[PDB]
Design a binder for this molecule. Structure first.
Ligand SMILES: [Zn+2]
Lengths: 30, 21, 30, 21, 30, 21
């Protein structure tokens, strides 16, 4: 695997691709 | 955090597994 | 709902997600 | 316009409804 | 057709949309 | 190359056909 720069709605896709059936939490800082 | 680190620098898929349930 | 920064092909997705069955018009300035 | 405002600043989904048919 | 600025995972989509059944090669410089 | 030119400048779909098999 390679090191990725991920920003946006593009990232959460990788959260789904990585996770999938486990589901994830998406926690930005605001 | 991840959102910030993956977006300010680079992160790996191994780091992403940490936030799966 | 939250305020979004949208740019690109990423935006037109939100046009589809917002609109859907109504359809939309996509009008950039050029 | 919307394309410019959503991309130079932020816009809301309510503003997006204006361009649905 | 119009001239596009393409960067990222967004691009490879256009590689699929352009190519499709032919398949493509994705060759970045690193 | 294409990845760099489409991402540093603009490219056209005709240029993309060159990398289909
Ligand atoms: Zn993007």
């Amino acid at each position: 695997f390679v090191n990725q720069h991920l920003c946006g709605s593009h990232l959460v896709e990788a959260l789904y691709l990585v996770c999938g059936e486990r589901g994830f939490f998406y926690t930005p800082k605001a | 955090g991840i959102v910030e680190q993956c977006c300010a620098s680079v992160c790996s898929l191994y780091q992403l597994e940490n936030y799966c349930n």
